[PDB]
Amino acid sequence: MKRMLINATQQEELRVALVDGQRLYDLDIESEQKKANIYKGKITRIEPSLEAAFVDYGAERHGFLPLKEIAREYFPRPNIKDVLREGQEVIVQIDKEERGNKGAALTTFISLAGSYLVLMPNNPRAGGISRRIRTELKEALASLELPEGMGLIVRTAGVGKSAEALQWDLSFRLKHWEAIKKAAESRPAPFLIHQESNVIVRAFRDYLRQDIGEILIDNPKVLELARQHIAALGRPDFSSKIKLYTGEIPLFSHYQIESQIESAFQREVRLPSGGSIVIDSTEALTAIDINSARDIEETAFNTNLEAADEIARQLRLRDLGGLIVIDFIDMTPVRHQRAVENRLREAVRQDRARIQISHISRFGLLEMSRQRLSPSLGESSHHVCPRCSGTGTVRDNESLSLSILRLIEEEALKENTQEVHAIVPVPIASYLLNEKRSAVNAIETRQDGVRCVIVPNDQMETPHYHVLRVRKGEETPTLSYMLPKLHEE
Amino acid sequence: MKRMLINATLRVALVDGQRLYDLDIHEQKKANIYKGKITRIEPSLEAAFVDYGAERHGFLPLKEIAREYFPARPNIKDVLREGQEVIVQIDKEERGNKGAALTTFISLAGSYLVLMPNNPRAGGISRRIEGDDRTELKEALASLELPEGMGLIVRTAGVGKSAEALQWDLSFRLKHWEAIKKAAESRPAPFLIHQESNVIVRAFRDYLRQDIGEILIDNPKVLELARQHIAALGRPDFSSKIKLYTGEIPLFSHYQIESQIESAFQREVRLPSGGSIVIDSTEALTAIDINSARGDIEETAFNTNLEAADEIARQLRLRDLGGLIVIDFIDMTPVRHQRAVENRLREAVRQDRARIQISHISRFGLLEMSRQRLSPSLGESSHHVCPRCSGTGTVRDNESLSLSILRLIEEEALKENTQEVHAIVPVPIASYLLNEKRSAVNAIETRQDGVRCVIVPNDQMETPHYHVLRVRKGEETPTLSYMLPKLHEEAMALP
Amino acid sequence: MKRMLINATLRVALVDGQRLYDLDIQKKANIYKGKITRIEPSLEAAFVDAERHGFLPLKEIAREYFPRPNIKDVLREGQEVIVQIDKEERALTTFISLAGSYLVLMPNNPRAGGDDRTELKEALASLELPEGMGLIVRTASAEALQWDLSFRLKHWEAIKKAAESRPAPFLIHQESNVIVRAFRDYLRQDIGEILIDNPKVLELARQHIAALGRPDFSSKIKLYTGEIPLFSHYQIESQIESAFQREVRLPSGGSIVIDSTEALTAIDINSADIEETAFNTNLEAADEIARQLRLRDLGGLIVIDFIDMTPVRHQRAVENRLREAVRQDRARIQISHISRFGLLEMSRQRLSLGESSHHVCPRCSGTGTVRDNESLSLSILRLIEEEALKENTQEVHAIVPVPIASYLLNEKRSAVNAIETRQDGVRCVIVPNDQMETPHYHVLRVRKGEETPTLSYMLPKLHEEAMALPSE
Amino acid sequence: MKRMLINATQQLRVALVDGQRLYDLDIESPGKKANIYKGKITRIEPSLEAAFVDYGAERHGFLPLKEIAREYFRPNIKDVLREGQEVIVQIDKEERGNKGAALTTFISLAGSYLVLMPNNPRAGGISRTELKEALASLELPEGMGLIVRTAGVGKSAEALQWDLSFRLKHWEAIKKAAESRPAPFLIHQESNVIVRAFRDYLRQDIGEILIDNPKVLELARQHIAALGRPDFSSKIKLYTGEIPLFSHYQIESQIESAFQREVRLPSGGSIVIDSTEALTAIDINSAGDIEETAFNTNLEAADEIARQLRLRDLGGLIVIDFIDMTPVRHQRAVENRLREAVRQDRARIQISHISRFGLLEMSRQRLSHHVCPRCSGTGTVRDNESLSLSILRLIEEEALKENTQEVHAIVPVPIASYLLNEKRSAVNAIETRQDGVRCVIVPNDQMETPHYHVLRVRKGEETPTLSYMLPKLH
Ligand SMILES: [Zn+2]
Ligand SMILES: [Zn+2]
């Protein structure tokens, strides 16, 4: 059975997992974003000067509706003064967030994005397959039963799919649209109809499919809200599937996903056979290295296939974006390289994100790209990494040392210098005073009379250090290792 | 003017003429050349033993003796006399018990050429060199004046130079080879003729070309050794060009190269126009990102990429970067820019001695390339991915992290047949779990009646890392809590 | 009065007046009535109903249940049977064995039974054992044995009475609940009361007594109710605290010092007529040491440095004191003489696994003395050079404590350089290691050819297997 | 080959070395008593029944009548001695205050095991069953007597004969050097630190004595002739290499082994030398056949222990926990191995067997830095268990106090681990019995294992500080 588990025992913090069995196969972790919210709005005032109008959609500031955005449905080359009345009600969607002094950009041409489809129930003039894409898709799109007054777009996401699966998405957009206009026809004008960005409506919109057997929710107050959204989205057949979790063992722990979730935070994730993948992220790209466990050709082939599967889901769970480079283990047969490519392609087939994959090159690398799905490059409860001090780069022991070494010498050059104390972490004092002993001696012999003291301090770690200057006369007879305390002041 | 500055108060920098364009900064024997006397012959091993000086005798198998020592499949007893003198090179250093592998087939490696003055049967362009590169090299090599009884090899390094530049390299090997057999004809048998690895001998062997005007040296004791090496290498035309630096301002500071040397240790290197390159290194490869400055867009991207290609080439030399390199060039829409950026990189690396191979800008806008670190020294990549992060700059809080491990613990304890669950966590995590969350740790144990939850503080880990191990019924040991990290040492280990 | 105090607010203390003389702080050998699930002539065994069925091989069926044969001939499916667990779930026998302190009754089967043994072979022949059964005398007098043998017989009766009174699947006897063990190990005829401070436990305590088959005792189990804690009211809490001290004061004023080393436990004896003092303090020591061995649960080898005595008759009297003082200890104990050096060597078998109170400082060899860093460095510094002089040496790695590396590579940097320069080509690597402290270090020699490009600070790990100690 | 190496380039160390096994060391560093002179009788005092002797000090020595040998003879001192009479004289007591030194013509030559009184036979004997048998077997000249030292517990008769004869050879040379000169000079210097080494460390099997210092080597030969053995002058040799003597002979590390707690054995096992209040416990760990390994490590142990006792100068009571051996014949062979290997030692040694417990007891007579952080300078550190239990009772005692809100136990990491796992139950028990009192046990990687803290937090003073942030706060 496929389940959607929703762990919501922090009422600010929120987790949604899809699960075939114990395949965690997709995850999301959530809760302002306002783009693509739908309101009923009253027209505040008309401006023939800007060929536009102003809409009270509930916000403290009025939205902005240009003429090019008004549907023929609301037209009772024309002046806007001839098209709209003041105080006229209108179903309105946000194109662009409020910026600076400027109210949100609003359009009546409403668009309902699904997983694979974007229904424009309001205008039929937009539609077709995307530029980014198509032979079977042009055949599958013509087969869907679309009402006459509307148009649809098939998202890059729609490409490895079937027509049967598209009809399921298209109909979920239709049921929603009915309810949008049903909840508009039922009220006075200033209110909100659809929230793009709250986590239940988004979870159902993105994560629901026909193969989903249950939706377990561990919080009653939420489960009630979850029902309401399902009827507003126009799918009662799902209410029966929504079920309340009540056990005292936590939802995600009862189903054994909490560790799999934990794997999306790790540098190294283990593969089923015993190998692993190491996910490093640079300024330019994300590098994924692959290591095997403890026939060589069969091992490399086997570990790569597992790697291809793990990388795929890690890309979903982590929500990784941009450029990705996979260093697959070397394989001599070309047929293996194809099978490792085709593994990865099938594994990323279920990913909603726009993903593009090349081959295994002559250097044994695979390049690919993924579009990060959410605007919020953000992390619910985190802090700056201390060791890298916020940037993701840690200075090699070589260069750190070399850097302090030039820094010591610059202090020894200064006039009136008696001594210079470098208080460094232990490995650095080890590297400086052995590997670089020659250069340490070179400084002291060139700065005749200047004491270079490099003291290993097990109280520091490797980004941190100190280089202190001791002027002629203020030197003490303190022992090298008792200095870190001395300079505690 | 081009100078070779040598700071030895050992660092060697090539300076045009206040710009710094190349830098160079283990008791070595492989590829030393001796005159040797034959100690004793072994027809049983089809080999002989040679006294080249060392406390242990070298090993010269029959397959290594040149026809120069032959008359007309023979027994080695018919070939050599005991105590017969012979010019000998070390193939392989002394390992364990054996003395050193020796061959009479001498080879003199230059920058671009390896002269085998001893045997003509082994020369040509190597297989590493792709056809379109080699095409002109097969033409340039046929044009060099090589004496009859000897053969050459064009190193992968030869790849970007000209026939006029190769003729300069080949002649330096010839001048040396002469002196090698002149110093051998002039003495009894047991001595050393050529030392492969003086940093002076190496610097001249690797870094001299006809375009080098001066060789400033700031150390007298070394300058004298430098002249001797020049005469021993057989090039008196360069003695005049070796000069003593004397100024009180350090050699490298007078020429303003010290900061440029400092750049080979930086993560981000400013380009001339304002943009930069970010050199990150990972486990697998070296990622280089390119950023631009501050207004034609296409021109900026093109122009920044060109500067990048030039900076990356020299940084690859100065850093001595090895292995796999991925360059993320700024995106360019015209294909003609993408070829120009590639060709910029090819012409910029053309003077690197290292074997370099460069592909195209792919559909993703990446350039893959490889480079051999030249030095037995294993290269430390200037910077690299933070291990606490994986290079996010972000780390989970201790609370969210404990709560996460909490449920992870309980998930393990709920598994059938579980006796114990061991959480090996960083010290402040065990502190938080076993104090602030003690109640909840107790709740697990009391709900999983019989399952021991062991949360052990481990001062060997820090805060993103942890471990949650499951102990099945019957395989628990009476080990103390604080001694579990050391016992699980075996397992918890990541490939 | 001898009491058994049970603090369960689980600790069990045997207390004579106000003297603490003993202290205590799985499914093998549990007994059930079981129904035979199904028979297997193939494995010559049967299955007995836990969520999983037990396994009863033919060799384990008593002659009592057979009304060389096949297992299908002996047993009927669904036949009830008194069953004991031989081995935990990873084995059932119908030979049952009831272990006491001194005796293991095999009430089912008499083909059992088991040269300090001279009086034991006589004492065992004197016990009144029913015909159909045999017994084993554990490693742990005849009058004291008859008390133990009868408590097993009382128990066995109740076991077959609780089986004759019910349907077939249930548990009869639980081998291991600390109350069962305390009554099994720590009950005797001379125990007047068993005070318990916890009602929930006292109730469980009574049930275990009737199950153990001794209703005469229920009267002697009493509930403690005072607000002053049970152990404090009886003044044993300090004596319990003495089991954790290095030095325990003797009645007369002398003391014993209990040190423990790697090999053994050294007990020294100090005092407060010289001959009479030594003799008398030694007698007091033999008493204290005996009960300290019980309270601490000390195991293995014990050497006792008694105060020296010149008359041989005192030495025997101090031995025989110690022998009779340990007589009540459950553990297997063996005692030798006071040797010509005035030591007494003895051994004790720790009853369950465990360790001791104080042992000897790793930092010293047990002195308190520790060489100054200056002297310690200079020592290592001459040691390093000694290694670099050796023929065929490529490198020499000093792995020293952090302050020693700091002293060596700063204050003594000149000398370190002097070694490297006089030993042309030999690398001195002095690595600071925050895993060591200051008496300890290592100086390792790296022959020509076997050097690795390992980083100075990573050597400690590369050298683990070769720098570890046969001590551990 | 057994050698005596003498390092004297440094201002003096003497090491007995067998092959390259340092087995004895002396570091005599010289700041009285038993010097021998030829002396002229300055003046006689019948008043004090004594005389005055010129032994060449600026002050005359004092020779009572009771100290004059029958050889030089109730009488007056005036009747026995003639003024200006020459006499072989030994110092009894160093010069004190105004008096000159006490002198006796009863002369005694101390060796390692024997004191020869070549002058008087009336003093000697014991106070042992075999020593009384062994002393009666020695060939001692009529006119003289001998004492067996406390050392001489550990002498064979053949070994005693070697000591006695070295005293006799010396005594001959003493009177030979007296007969050959006028009267005021010094004959034998007891104390000049080379004399001790030759007196304690020389024997017939010493091939060479290498000395790295000329000034000292000259002094070393004079002392040999004065000790009366010119046959050795040829065996004393000047070391000259730039490599220090003790480093050329590879013994400097073996000298440094005497300071360690564990010493590795040749085969790979080791011995652990731990010293308590009562005794020295030596434990033995091993590195195929198990019976052969245990036997073979124990043999090496016995050998190593023997010389460690010598190098360390351990004294008193020693208990050796040999690796268990089931065969009784090995037990005897490990015993006999120890006995033979201490046979060289100069100290008084006694050895029992391997007991039923597998332990060997033995005693040795001793022949002649800064407070440890970790045990506060006593013998003992606590077990993590006992320490934890100790802190645990201490935590509860703080929680009992009136007006307590919290009790913070700042312990080392392994202690926090043991307390909060193995003892978690008891930690809960305190908190639940002290309703409302928070027990905070915080692991602190800044401390190690003897140290800790238990702090009390009164009601109202508690902060919202995180557990692990409490070390810093405090
Ligand atoms: Zn980081
Ligand atoms: Zn200590």
Residue numbers in the entry:
A (entry chain A): 1 to 31, 35 to 79, 87 to 143, 148 to 308, 314 to 508
B (entry chain B): 1 to 9, 14 to 29, 34 to 80, 87 to 308, 313 to 513
C (entry chain D): 1 to 9, 14 to 29, 36 to 59, 62 to 79, 87 to 109, 115 to 138, 146 to 171, 176 to 307, ...
D (entry chain C): 1 to 11, 14 to 33, 37 to 78, 87 to 140, 148 to 307, 313 to 393, 401 to 506
Show the paper's wording.
RNase E is an essential bacterial endoribonuclease involved in the turnover of messenger RNA and the maturation of structured RNA precursors in Escherichia coli. The N-terminal half forms the catalytic domain (residues 1–530), resembles its paralog RNase G, and is relatively conserved among prokaryotes (Marcaida et al., 2006). The RNase E catalytic domain forms a dimer of dimers, with a quaternary organization resembling two pairs of scissors arranged in tandem. Between these two domains is a pair of conserved CPxCxGxG motifs, one on each monomer, that coordinate a single zinc ion.
Here, we present the first crystal structure of the E. coli RNase E catalytic domain in the apo form at 3.3 Å resolution. Specifically, each is twisted by about 45° in the apoprotein relative to its orientation in the holoprotein, and the tetramer is bent out of the plane by ∼40°. Two zinc ions are present in the structure, one in each pocket. In each of the four apoprotein protomers, the combined S1 subdomain and 5′ sensor (from here on referred to collectively as the “5/S1 subdomain”) has moved as a single unit through an angle of about 60° relative to the holoprotein configuration. This conformational change significantly exposes both the binding and catalytic sites to the surrounding solvent and probably permits substrates to be more easily bound to the enzyme. Additional electron density was identified in the 5′ sensing pocket in three of the four monomers. On the basis of the coordination geometry and the buffer composition, we propose that this density is likely to be a sulfate ion. This ion is hydrogen-bonded to the T170 side chain and amide group, as well as to the R169 side chain, mimicking the interaction between RNase E and the 5′-monophosphate group of RNA seen in the holoprotein structure. In the structure presented here, these residues are oriented as in the previously reported holoprotein, but no electron density was apparent near the catalytic sites, suggesting that the metal may be absent.
